[PDB]
Symmetry: C3
Subunit: 336 residues, 3 copies
């Protein structure tokens, strides 16, 4: 497309919502290519990541860890206004794995506190993709401070299975998984700091052990449970987008399956089927499609069970509907 051709395309402004919810969108593209407009303000803020009051100096796109999911269609343009308020202390930028050139946009978006920038890229490849901050010389520090999210570039005809059959979800959720590296004192107590830079040296020491102190969904232990449990009903089709910008993960829906899983996150790569546990390498997003068949509580986990149940990587689904005794039944309940 020429500059003139791009300037003639319809514009659409999107209002983002906090994960794990996803902003309003259409699965099948509505009309021809558009320039889809998003704005995010970066917030450096303290987050509490466990029930012991452990703090992280988060660097948060749109004030959340992960940043929000942006949804466009293939060959749309994503036009992001990124704002670094004067209240922040560090330079930030953004690299979209979906984008081509300038280190995913990072080279064109370096903004000091009090600056903003506008980046437009063509979403040429369909799939879910990580985005994250990456300031030269301080890249993993920003990423493991929670400065990452994902986007979804849907095929213009929406999702299909490996054989061209349409796959239409009723619900979509975005689970951003975060490895954190929190310094500890002599007694094994987590350290607190009063500015992000104060934590840098101690945090880098922990990072270099390659052993996270916490592995969490949506920024904290137990975040996507209780008031934030994800919901569905028997018969409902659900897409679960999952990202991890720095470290491998192995999602698993306990009590369910990934009926179709784009494990690599890329929609032109046919999905795996009937998955028990799928694998998403650090630096990528993946997506799983499942139709619920049983009601009740599900756990959704990173299936290194130490990571899930000791380090924090466990979410819940609450599913309504009728129990199916054909699929599963207690022939004899626990008894003497």
């Amino acid at each position: 497309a020429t500059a003139a051709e791009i300037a003639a395309l319809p514009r659409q402004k999107v209002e983002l919502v906090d994960p794990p919810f996803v902003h309003a969108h259409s699965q099948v593209a509505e009309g021809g290519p558009k320039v889809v407009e998003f704005t995010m303000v970066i917030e450096e803020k303290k987050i509490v990541i466990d029930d012991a009051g452990t703090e992280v100096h988060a660097m948060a796109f749109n004030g959340t860890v992960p940043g929000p999911l942006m949804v466009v269609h293939q060959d749309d343009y994503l036009e992001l206004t990124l704002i670094n308020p004067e209240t922040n202390t560090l330079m930030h930028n953004i690299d979209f794995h979906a984008a081509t050139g300038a280190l995913g946009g990072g080279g064109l978006t370096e903004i000091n506190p009090g600056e903003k920038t506008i980046l437009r890229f063509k979403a040429t490849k369909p799939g879910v993709f990580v985005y994250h901050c990456a300031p030269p010389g301080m890249v993993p520090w920003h990423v493991v401070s929670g400065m990452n999210g994902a986007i979804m570039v849907l095929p213009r005809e929406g999702l299909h299975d490996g054989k061209g059959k349409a796959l239409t979800y009723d619900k979509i959720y975005y689970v951003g998984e975060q490895d954190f590296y929190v310094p500890r004192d002599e007694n094994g107590k987590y350290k607190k700091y009063e500015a992000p830079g104060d934590a840098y040296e101690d945090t880098v020491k922990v990072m270099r052990t390659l052993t996270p102190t916490h592995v969490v969904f949506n920024g904290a232990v137990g975040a996507l449970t209780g008031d934030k449990a994800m919901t569905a009903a028997v018969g409902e089709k659900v897409l679960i987008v999952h990202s991890q910008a720095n470290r491998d993960t192995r999602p698993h829906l306990i009590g369910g399956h990934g009926d179709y899983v784009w494990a690599t996150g890329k929609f032109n790569t046919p999905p795996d089927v009937d998955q028990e546990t799928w694998f998403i390498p650090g630096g990528a997003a993946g997506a799983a499609f499942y139709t619920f068949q049983q009601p009740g509580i599900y756990a959704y986990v990173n299936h290194n069970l130490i990571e899930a149940f000791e380090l924090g990587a466990a979410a819940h689904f609450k599913v309504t509907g009728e129990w199916n005794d054909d699929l599963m039944t207690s022939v004899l309940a626990p008894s003497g």
Copy 2:
């Protein structure tokens, strides 16, 4: 199917065998859906995991680590009688990754010592699948104490490659891989404990490092070596089912390949081919099919070679038959330059 129709189905009682062997089964389903019945007694038992005599308080389905492989066909029902004898100290249950609902069955099979339960589920999806104990609040501790195994749900028409051609194995082995986290004293020697409970706190500390002290097949360093080495012959087609309920592994047959590998373990996902090293994420089972072409000793390993050769994750195959110099030959044996 209705309760009445399920009641009308044939029942088949299966006698389980200890890994790495697999109970008698037919690759292609014989007749229509059946209710396939299994029984396992859970044993909390001290096991030795290396030649030094390092002990673990294992939590073992059917008394083995891993638990035995159950084999059914797609759309059969698996009916398990699970028994927690009164000699045990902990509540246990079972989660089948093959199953749908109630956390894979865990929500319906919580049994205290002195209790039993019977769970039935429809094996709707073909593949190899992990099963493991998962008591709420104590999940990874049971799993890394060895309380896990796998099942195989064969397609009713047996295995096929990605393009519809039948693949019939001559023999099958099940290799369960176990990450263990054994506490050490100030000398760096492994600690011993009186009851499972006494090891809990020290073990959780090790688990949190995400660094196992041992990574083993069939419950111990070298368990599948010597007179317990797996066997094959040139021309023999072997399926190797491999599971890891908690931690990633990367299987490799040293001197061979995975001709067809269902790396995700799911038979409706076409197999990768000609594999050197495949990848099975923690919480899954995978399966590799290989026709041996050369005789001699092979090592079958997790190809993080530290894990294989320092931590224990190496098994052997002994293979009989004629050497093939077309495939490989020593043109000049090691000799002075």
Copy 3:
């Protein structure tokens, strides 16, 4: 083939080239099956791997870490003369993951200092494959001392996509990724040793933590950066072969993609497409095909960003050509 048929095949000697470069070859096979002859001399030598003068007693096929890429076609034979000079102090051998029998060749190639051996094997399977030394009882120590490389066995008709369309690269690079485990003294300073064996016990202790001290491309931190960046031009098709003989990696071209990725490294397994970050398990090689669309500096990393930017697993590409504003443009440059 019959004995006389094998004996009658042409023999061709090929001169090796140090990584990341690859010796001249044809993508489509020239003529019928050949016995392709290579020679490598093993060098035991101290190398410096970082900016602090940290040393490793390298054990290096052909004098390099990684060992060089050998390229043949399916159903050719690879015939390697492996030489262990008498100035070395350890026994070495070679296991080709591409080969069938005798532990990949290791059982037939155990050479003490002052010995050589010639191994021939038929390259029956197309793909990129790891090779490494593997002396019984000291396997990981040799491998993590850098004694590993890869080969490529091209299909006789060259590479194709999942739909049988030919994929022809303009250039190819071989990135060998090495995990090192360098002992430290109690002050955190890396230790130095007189002879390789002196480091054995201390090194195994580090190895058993499963936490490398360095994760590097081409044998050292920054080996493929700056004036040793890899190069391409907009419009150029590049194959990047990546290996890791002991430990998982997750390659990512920052600013680009893997247009086609044989993540398992095997050409009869259809390539994944449009990849952001692919995954190569320890003990394997993979290959990614990309057509460059934007000029500028790219980084090519293991996308555990701590491994990439704290531990050393980052390379650069310097790409010439014209910027494409359709793919990406700065609508508003960073501004107050």
